[PDB]
Amino acid sequence: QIAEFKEAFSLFDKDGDGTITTKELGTVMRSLGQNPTEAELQDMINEVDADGNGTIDFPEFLTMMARKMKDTDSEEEIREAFRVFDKDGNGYISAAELRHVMTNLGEKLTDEEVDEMIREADIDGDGQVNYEEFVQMMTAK
């Protein structure tokens, strides 16, 4: 709980001012455990207090988490998913496909996000990824 989250906050305070930039709200939620939308963050970054704020303290954030807890908890439920990219049912997809799914589809990610992600993803010498293992690793927590 709060002891590791406070250390996570103290690694997001860089300056040491007790407060972190309001822009880094989504990354701090993600660091603790959650997986919220950038929209969901916008819908709860707004306030009259934190909308006006340039930086947020750990008491403020703890208050925001308490208010939005149910919605915030809802974004750790998923553990299963389906894709495609394999039609033949190999169970494997290329790194090229995975990049195309992530950067051209849905809520498009950047290449730098995908490159950051393939530092914690098993990739064989062929250049393919077992997507059943990959879904287990990304939900692993």
Binding site: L11, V101, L105, E113, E116
Partner: protein, 49 residues
């Protein structure tokens, strides 16, 4: 289509959580190394003097 884009969007959220946590774990590993290296260098100089 509006159902299957909502498998891509959800995974895109979980990957954004995964990368941030991984980035944090790596920074904690580098910070843990710097502090101990430092404790050693403060101690090693003081002993000799």
């Amino acid at each position: 289509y509006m159902r299957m884009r909502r498998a891509a969007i959800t995974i895109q959220r979980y990957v954004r959580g995964h990368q941030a946590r991984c980035y944090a774990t790596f920074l904690r590993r580098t910070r843990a190394a710097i502090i101990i290296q430092k404790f050693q260098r403060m101690y090693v100089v003081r002993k000799r003097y």
